[PDB]
């Protein structure tokens, strides 16, 4: 079975920051750069 990322799946980076996906947003709801590029992931600064 080919598993796609879904809510409740666990993501992590190499620096010990880990978490589960809680929300998948449509492309038009994400914050975007002035050139129209939307970001892919939003991380809380309170974890740092």
């Amino acid at each position: 079975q080919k598993r796609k990322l879904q809510v409740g799946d666990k993501l992590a980076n190499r620096h010990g920051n880990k978490g589960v996906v809680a929300k998948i947003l449509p492309v038009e709801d994400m914050p975007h750069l002035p050139d129209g590029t939307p970001v892919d992931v939003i991380l809380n600064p309170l974890g740092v």
Binding site: R3, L5, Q6, V7, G8, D9, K10, L11, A12, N13, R14, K18, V20, V27, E28, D29, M30, P31, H32, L33, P34, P38, V39, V41, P45
Partner: protein, 48 residues
């Protein structure tokens, strides 16, 4: 910019490119529910 309103976030944000991993812990493998099912031999309590 905020994709919902089109207004900028009131402060500059740290945006960048980060390497993130999808870990082996998936909610697909962990969600479990039971109403009734197998029971133990001696104690007759539900299995685990």
């Amino acid at each position: 910019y905020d994709g919902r309103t089109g207004e900028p976030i009131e402060g500059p944000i740290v945006v960048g490119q980060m390497f993130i991993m999808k870990l082996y812990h998936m909610v697909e493998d962990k969600m479990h529910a039971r109403s009734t099912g197998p029971y133990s031999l001696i104690t007759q309590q539900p299995l685990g």
